[PDB]
Amino acid sequence: MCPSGKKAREIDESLIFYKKWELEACVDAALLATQMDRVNAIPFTYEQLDVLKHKLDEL
Amino acid sequence: QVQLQQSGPELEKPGASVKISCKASGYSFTGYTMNWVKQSHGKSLEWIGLITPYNGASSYNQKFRGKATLTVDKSSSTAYMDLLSLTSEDSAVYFCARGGYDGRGFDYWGSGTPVTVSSASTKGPSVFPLAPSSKSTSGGTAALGCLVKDYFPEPVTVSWNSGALTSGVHTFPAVLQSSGLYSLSSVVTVPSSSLGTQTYICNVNHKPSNTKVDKKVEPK
Amino acid sequence: DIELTQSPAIMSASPGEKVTMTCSASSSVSYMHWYQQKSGTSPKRWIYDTSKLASGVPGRFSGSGSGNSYSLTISSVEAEDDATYYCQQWSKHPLTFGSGTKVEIKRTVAAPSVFIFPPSDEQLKSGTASVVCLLNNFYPREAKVQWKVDNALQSGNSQESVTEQDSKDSTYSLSSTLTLSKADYEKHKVYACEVTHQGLSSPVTKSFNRG
C-alpha cells in the first residue's frame, strides 16, 4: 500500500527520500518507463536503483 | 571503522570562495550518499544537499543553490564542497555525513570544518600562565591554567601535558574581545602536594596562524 | 518546507526520571530521525526510522510518533544524557531539522570554589594586564561576579565565559577576565572579585596585592 499522499506523480528528486519499500509501493512502472531519462540524474542509492530496475523488468 | 576526515579551519575574505573536503575510509565510498550540513555558531542544523559518488548525481536544498557546489573524486574516496562568493553569513561549521543504508538518517559524521568569513587577518595567540599560589590553595587542591590572548580566527586547541592530563580540565569558550580578537583560558585543578614534583604544560595549537605553543606553568 | 518545532526548548531533568521531548512537524512525515550533539562534537545518530535504536545507544532511549507528532523518550535519565537532541524529517525534499531540545541534568546545589590569578610578568611588558577569576564546579549555572579595584566597583572592562555542563558531575565552571592597561594596573594595589551564588550563604571574595 502506498501511504496516503505519497504516490509518485513525477520521477523527480523528492523520491530520493523514499525508502526502498516506498519506491516499490508508490512508483507505478509505466510512469517510470516514460520518465526513465530522469533517473540517472537523481542521486539514488544502489539499493534504490535495484528497486527501480526491478520495476522496469516487471514490464 | 568508518571515518570522515574533513579539512582544517578556513579564513576567507568576503567575496572569495573556498573548497572544503571530506575523505572517507573504512567503507565502499560509492555504496552510500554523502551529505553536507551547516551549523551556525550556536544554532541549528541545515541540510545543504547530497551526492551519490558513483555517477556524481547530486541534489541541493534550494537555499544553497549557487552558494554551494558538491563534487567527488572517487579515486581518493574524497567528497568536496565549494562555497562561493562568501559573506559573513556563511561563517559557520560545515559537516559531511554519510547517509545510512536505505535512508536511515546520517549514520557517520565528520568532525566539522569551521569557516570564518571576515576582512581581518590571521593573528596568533600569545600564551600566558595562570599560576597557583597560597592564593590558589583550597585545602590541598590548587588551580592553574593558561590564558591564550588576542588571536584570530577560531578555533584554537588546548590540551595539557600532551593529552596525558584530562581529569580536572576546563577549557573555556573563546570570547570575542573588542579588540576584535579572540581570547580564552584553559584551567585545571590538582592537589597542592603535587606541585613540587609534577610539572604542567599547556599545549596550544592554532592551525590558521600555524602556532603551536607549550607553556610550562609554575608557581610564583 | 517541512517545519519542525521541538519542545520543550530546554528540558531539565533529575536523574532517574522518565522524560519525553516532542517534535511537531508542520505537515505529514513518514520517518523521523534524532541526533544527540554535545557541545563541540559532531552530532550522533541516536534514534532512526522514528523508533529504532541506532548502534551503541543505550536501551533507555526510545522513539515514537505518528503523522505530525514525534517524540523521543529517556526512560531513566542519567548524567551523561546532557546534550542537545535534534529531530530530522526524512520525508519531503529538502531535509529539515528542528532547532533542538537541550537537556540539562538536575543535581544538588554546589557552591563555586573560587580562585583569582594576577597578570603575568610576561603579559605586563606587553602593555596590557589581565586578571582572571575562576569559579569552579558549581551548580546551578547562575552566578554573579563583581570586580573591585581598591574598592572601586569595576565595570565595562570584564568578560565572562562558561563551560557546558559536565557529563559526569553535572557542574559548570565560569571565568571572568578583567582587562586593563599596564598603566591603570600599575596604579592600584588591591584586586578582588566578589562572587555570589545560590549555594553561598554570603559572598565569597578572593583578593590580592600586586606583591
Side-chain angles (χ1 to χ4, degrees), chain A, chain B residues 2-220, chain C:
Chain A
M1 202 197 59
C2 191
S4 169
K6 189 117 183 184
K7 194 192 188 173
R9 290 167 290 172
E10 204 186 2
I11 304 308
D12 62 19
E13 70 183 337
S14 61
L15 297 181
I16 69 186
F17 298 120
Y18 282 42
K19 242 90 168 127
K20 296 195 301 208
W21 76 265
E22 281 169 323
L23 296 175
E24 171 61 24
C26 287
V27 181
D28 153 86
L31 173 66
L32 175 75
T34 73
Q35 283 163 18
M36 205 165 68
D37 64 317
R38 311 275 227 262
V39 162
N40 182 64
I42 302 171
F44 281 127
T45 53
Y46 283 141
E47 324 95 72
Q48 278 166 322
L49 285 185
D50 284 345
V51 164
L52 299 181
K53 174 165 176 192
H54 181 83
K55 285 271 172 205
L56 293 200
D57 302 344
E58 283 166 1
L59 302 166
Chain B
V2 174
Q3 280 189 5
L4 306 163
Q5 176 77 19
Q6 290 191 251
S7 59
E10 305 277 275
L11 166 53
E12 292 300 325
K13 315 201 69 50
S17 68
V18 67
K19 192 187 243 248
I20 65 186
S21 79
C22 181
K23 170 160 180 132
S25 33
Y27 64 106
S28 196
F29 194 51
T30 75
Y32 298 75
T33 66
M34 182 81 66
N35 289 251
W36 293 82
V37 172
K38 167 202 216 195
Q39 172 160 50
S40 300
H41 172 84
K43 290 222 181 313
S44 194
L45 302 165
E46 309 165 71
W47 181 68
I48 295 167
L50 69 75
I51 182 159
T52 45
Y54 176 69
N55 69 354
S58 57
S59 182
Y60 309 69
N61 185 338
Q62 206 184 45
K63 297 185 200 192
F64 289 90
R65 271 248 89 142
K67 178 54 65 173
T69 306
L70 315 179
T71 61
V72 298
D73 178 17
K74 273 138 67 171
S75 71
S76 68
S77 316
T78 302
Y80 295 104
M81 177 171 55
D82 231 64
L83 290 172
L84 298 121
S85 169
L86 293 161
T87 73
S88 80
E89 277 174 44
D90 304 312
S91 285
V93 163
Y94 293 87
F95 298 98
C96 58
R98 180 183 91 162
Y101 181 87
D102 192 23
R104 302 160 181 166
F106 302 159
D107 71 349
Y108 283 97
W109 296 61
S111 26
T113 290
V115 178
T116 279
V117 185
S118 124
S119 290
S121 291
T122 287
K123 173 164 193 299
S126 326
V127 183
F128 314 108
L130 287 168
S133 35
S134 59
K135 246 326 91 44
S136 184
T137 22
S138 242
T141 293
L144 61 101
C146 294
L147 171 63
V148 188
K149 192 171 145 60
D150 286 334
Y151 71 82
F152 187 101
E154 284 246 79
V156 303
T157 254
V158 184
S159 52
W160 281 88
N161 293 349
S162 331
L165 174 45
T166 80
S167 202
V169 169
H170 295 311
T171 307
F172 288 100
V175 151
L176 181 61
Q177 300 167 115
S178 45
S179 320
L181 315 166
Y182 283 108
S183 188
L184 74 74
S185 300
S186 184
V187 295
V188 69
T189 68
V190 304
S192 292
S193 54
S194 64
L195 302 191
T197 51
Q198 192 47 46
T199 45
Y200 305 84
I201 286 171
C202 65
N203 331 110
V204 181
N205 185 8
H206 185 239
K207 311 200 189 65
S209 54
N210 286 308
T211 313
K212 249 283 215 52
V213 170
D214 300 14
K215 205 82 176 174
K216 289 143 211 60
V217 196
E218 280 148 25
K220 236 263 180 193
Chain C
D1 293 10
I2 282 176
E3 232 202 57
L4 302 171
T5 294
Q6 291 195 257
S7 59
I10 286 182
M11 186 182 284
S12 70
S14 290
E17 275 173 345
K18 193 204 208 139
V19 288
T20 298
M21 60 186 77
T22 301
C23 179
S24 306
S26 67
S27 73
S28 161
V29 157
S30 58
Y31 294 97
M32 194 76 77
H33 311 303
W34 297 75
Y35 303 88
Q36 176 201 255
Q37 188 188 34
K38 293 212 183 207
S39 88
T41 70
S42 319
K44 291 191 222 71
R45 190 176 62 156
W46 222 235
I47 298 282
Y48 71 94
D49 294 353
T50 304
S51 57
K52 303 174 182 159
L53 285 189
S55 19
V57 173
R60 46 171 205 276
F61 291 98
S62 65
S64 63
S66 198
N68 308 21
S69 245
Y70 293 75
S71 50
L72 190 167
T73 303
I74 314 171
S75 69
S76 180
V77 171
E78 301 199 336
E80 74 174 25
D81 302 331
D82 67 314
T84 292
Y85 300 78
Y86 298 96
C87 61
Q88 170 192 63
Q89 63 91 11
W90 196 273
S91 167
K92 261 183 58 187
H93 189 296
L95 295 178
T96 38
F97 290 94
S99 59
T101 294
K102 166 163 254 195
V103 171
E104 95 110 34
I105 294 307
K106 295 179 185 219
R107 53 154 300 156
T108 49
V109 203
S113 337
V114 181
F115 305 92
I116 188 173
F117 299 102
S120 49
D121 284 83
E122 293 66 300
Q123 183 201 356
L124 284 149
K125 287 113 202 193
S126 292
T128 54
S130 298
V131 199
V132 170
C133 187
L134 167 61
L135 280 58
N136 213 43
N137 299 342
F138 52 99
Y139 179 95
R141 200 171 164 287
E142 303 82 82
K144 247 63 172 73
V145 186
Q146 284 195 337
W147 285 98
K148 278 165 175 151
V149 173
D150 291 332
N151 273 311
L153 166 70
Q154 290 326 299
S155 165
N157 31 28
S158 55
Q159 291 185 283
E160 285 186 0
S161 171
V162 183
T163 64
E164 278 303 328
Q165 192 169 30
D166 194 278
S167 296
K168 326 187 67 175
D169 63 21
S170 313
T171 62
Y172 300 93
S173 310
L174 172 161
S175 72
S176 201
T177 314
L178 179 70
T179 293
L180 300 180
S181 61
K182 168 111 161 169
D184 301 348
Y185 179 70
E186 276 180 328
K187 280 229 185 66
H188 315 284
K189 163 163 138 179
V190 187
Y191 293 98
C193 70
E194 182 186 271
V195 169
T196 60
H197 178 268
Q198 217 154 304
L200 298 177
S201 60
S202 60
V204 164
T205 292
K206 296 271 139 89
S207 25
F208 83 82
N209 281 16
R210 224 140 55 86

